[PDB]
Amino acid sequence: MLKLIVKNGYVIDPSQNLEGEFDILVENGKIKKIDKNILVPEAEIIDAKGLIVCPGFIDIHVHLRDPGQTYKEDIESGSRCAVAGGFTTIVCMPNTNPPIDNTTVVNYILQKSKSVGLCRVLPTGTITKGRKGKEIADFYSLKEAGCVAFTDDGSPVMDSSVMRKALELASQLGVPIMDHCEDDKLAYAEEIQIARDGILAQRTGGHVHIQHVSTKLSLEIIEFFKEKGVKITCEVNPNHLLEDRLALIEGVKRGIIDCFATDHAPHQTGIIGLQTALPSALELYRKGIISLKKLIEMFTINPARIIGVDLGTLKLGSPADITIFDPNKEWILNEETNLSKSRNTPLWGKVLKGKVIYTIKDGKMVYKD
Ligand SMILES: [Zn+2]
């Protein structure tokens, strides 16, 4: 099989303002052509009739618990949840044990990702050594080794002078600082912190990404900074939307929230979400809060742009990372379907609507329903 033809689907690629009933031809792990009615020899054909065909999803906030808490989740089990949920690329947080503050840990995660061979797992580095909040980490080395962002996630930066230094360095390197996830409260004020981050981002030219927002005022502050050209973004977990749910839904509706990111947070006594993010987001679509195109933007090109990777598109020549889903397929996360080592989600046992049928990474099927 030299080629794949994804046939009969409704293709949506927001990055190109492209949508319609088209086929996709994939060769050499790349998008080769998008056209009506493609047939070539030596191909596998996926029949996407009645399905939505779009770039592979990108989750920029996942806790894989690896190294150090691999009984809760590991790179393999999280990657299995990821591809089952349409994600071809996930970004793992650095509050592992040991934390991702040196190239040995970085290389560990990259080699795991390679051997597991499902989704791309991109590491982040810590902002400070040991995430202790005192001494800035070596962002140059960590980036060179493959880190795509920096965060003390686990534990928000409390030292304003550390945040400024972090954003300074981030600006030199062309990578974001992620801030304001308290995952450490179980692996191991909001408005003021966001305003601080917006101010420092403006002052340094660095990109800050707010990992958790919960109030209308936080959203209004973020939108203010964005309107003034400050490189600030934010995310929401669609699983949490079904604090201040309603303000968050208005923030999605108005485009203040840039992307869906799960904050997949395995625990065995934050919620898991990679495997359910899509049906959760689709509930907002079915309720008229967002268009399907906007839903796709928030899973694809928007998070790609936040982390500066050339993914989240179906542009000719790009990696053939492709998600194929049925917006109306009902299913339940339970013991028959769960690929996490944990079960910590209020969606457990509930009827979900929307399911990934195929996930394709570099032209290879890595998930099929
Ligand atoms: Zn986190």
Curated annotation (Swiss-Prot):
Pathway terms, separated by semicolons: Pyrimidine metabolism; UMP biosynthesis via de novo pathway; (S)-dihydroorotate from bicarbonate: step 3/3
One GO CC term, this protein: cytoplasm
The protein's Enzyme Commission number: 3.5.2.3
Catalytic reaction equation(s): (S)-dihydroorotate + H2O = N-carbamoyl-L-aspartate + H(+)
Cited SUPFAM superfamilies: Composite domain of metallo-dependent hydrolases, Metallo-dependent hydrolases
Cofactor note: Binds 1 Zn(2+) ion per subunit. Fully functional with a mononuclear metal center. Does not require a second metal for activity, although the conservation of the second metal-binding site during evolution leaves open the possibility that a second ion might bind in vivo.
Regulation: The monomer has very low activity by itself. Activated several thousandfold by formation of a complex with PyrB aspartate carbamoyltransferase (ATCase).
Outcome of mutating H212A: Does not affect activity
Residues reported to bind substrate: H63, L64, R65, N95, H267
Keyword Hydrolase: yes
Binding site for Zn(2+): H61, H63, D153, D263
Cofactor: Zn(2+)
Protein keywords: Hydrolase, Metal-binding, Pyrimidine biosynthesis, Zinc
GO BP field: 'de novo' UMP biosynthetic process; purine nucleobase catabolic process
Family: Belongs to the metallo-dependent hydrolases superfamily. DHOase family. Class I DHOase subfamily.
Protein name per its UniProtKB record: Dihydroorotase
Native source organism of the sequence: Aquifex aeolicus (strain VF5)
Phylogenetic classification of the source organism: Bacteria, Pseudomonadati, Aquificota, Aquificia, Aquificales
Gene name, Swiss-Prot/TrEMBL: pyrC
